[PDB]
C-alpha cells in the first residue's frame, strides 16, 4: 500500500551551509523517500520556518523542526495512504494549527508534504513528474538562468537577477548547453575585462547600471555564437521592493519606473520582468500592467509570495500576468498545486523557482514539468545544487522519449 509507516527527520546543511530539514518517509509497501527543504531567506505573508535560535549554527538550527517531525507530524501521518496527497497535506496543515504554519514549522510541514509525494510516486512506479502531473505532463521548461547577480546581493546595479532564457533551442538538452556555453562565454568576457567569483546561485558579481548588465550579456551571447532574442532571450527579477515614502532608485516613481522598463523592453529582447514596482504597491502593478502588459511577461515574486489569497486579488485586481512559484513559501504540495491550478484556470503563466539556500534535491525539476509551467528558474549553470535540477531535467527529457516537448518560444508568446 501507499500507507505511511515511518516519518523520520534529519538536520542537514543547504547550499549556503546552513541547517535545514530532511524528511525520510517509509511507506508500508517498502518505499523509503528522502526530501529536503531550502530556507533561502522572508515576509509576514510567507510561511514561518521553525528555527532554533541560540548560538548553535548562528541561530539557524533546525532541531526543533526535526523534533517537531518525529514527535508530532510522524505519528499524525503514520498509517495513512501517501496517494491522498490532499488529505495528507490538509492533515499536516491542521495539526500545525496556525495561518503562518508557525507552530510545527513550514520547513517541517513541507518536508513531510514532499516526502509523501515522493513515496506516493515510487509506490505507483511513476517518475515524480509523471505521477504528480499525471501522464499528459511532457513540457520541459525554459531554463531561466541567473548569470549575473546584482543590487541587493554593492547596490550598484540595482537589478537583483539578470537571466539568460534559451527560448530558441530545439530541445531542453540544447537549451542547457546554450546556457552553459554562454555562462562560460561571459566568464571569458569578464576575465578579459577587469570585471569572476561566484554568487549564492552560481551567478557572477561593481557595475555601471542595468544597461551595463544587458550590454555585457548581449555580447556574451554573441561571443558564444548565439543570436540574442532568436536563440537566447533575456529577463530579470528587479525585486523592486528592494529599490524602495516613494522609494524608486534604479530616482523614479512607479509610472516613471514603468518608462525605465519600457526603455529596456524596446532594445533588449526581454521575455519576462520579475517583481517590478515593489510588493504591496498595487497601483504600480496596474500601471506596469497597463504600460508593458502585452510586450513583456510580468511575474510576481514577493508581491504574491506564492499565496493564493494574494494572487486571487492580483488576478481579480489585474496585477501581473504570471506567478513565481516557491513551494517553501506556501508549505504544502497540494496548496502549491492549487496555486498552479488557480493561476492556470485564470491563465497566468507559471515559473517554478528555487531559493538561495538550496539542496541536492531535484524535486523542483520534476515538479516544473508536471505542472507544465514551461519555465523554471533554478540558477546559473554553476553550483551543483543548481545544476542537479538541470541534470534531472536532462533525464526526464530522456525518460519522456518522443513524448517530450521543449516550451522554448511558446513559453513566452511576446517577443
Ligand atoms: Mg527575487
Author numbering: 1 to 41, 43 to 154, 156 to 197, 199 to 208, 210 to 248, 251 to 256, 260 to 424
The authors write:
The octameric fraction was further used for structural studies. The structure of enolase in the apo state was determined using both cryoEM and X-ray crystallography. One of them, described here as IF1, is similar to the interface observed in conventional dimers, whereas the other, IF2, exists in between two neighboring dimers and has only been reported in bacterial enolases. Further, the MtEno crystal structure was superposed with its Synechococcus elongates counterpart with which it showed a low RMSD of 0.65 Å. The protein overall fold is highly conserved, except for a small conformational variation in loop 1 [Fig. S4(a)]. Notably, the pK a of Lys335 is estimated to be ∼11.5 in the MtEno WT apo state, unable to facilitate a reduction reaction on the carbanion intermediate.
Enolase, a ubiquitous enzyme, catalyzes the reversible conversion of 2-phospho­glycerate (2PG) to phospho­enolpyruvate (PEP) in the glycolytic pathway of organisms of all three domains of life. Here we present structural snapshots of Mycobacterium tuberculosis (Mtb) enolase in apo, PEP-bound and two 2PG-bound forms as it catalyzes the conversion of PEP to 2PG. MtEno has a topology similar to other enolase structures, a smaller N-terminal domain and a larger C-terminal domain. The crystal and the cryoEM structures (enzyme in solution, frozen) along with the biochemical studies clearly demonstrate that the functional unit of MtEno is an octamer.
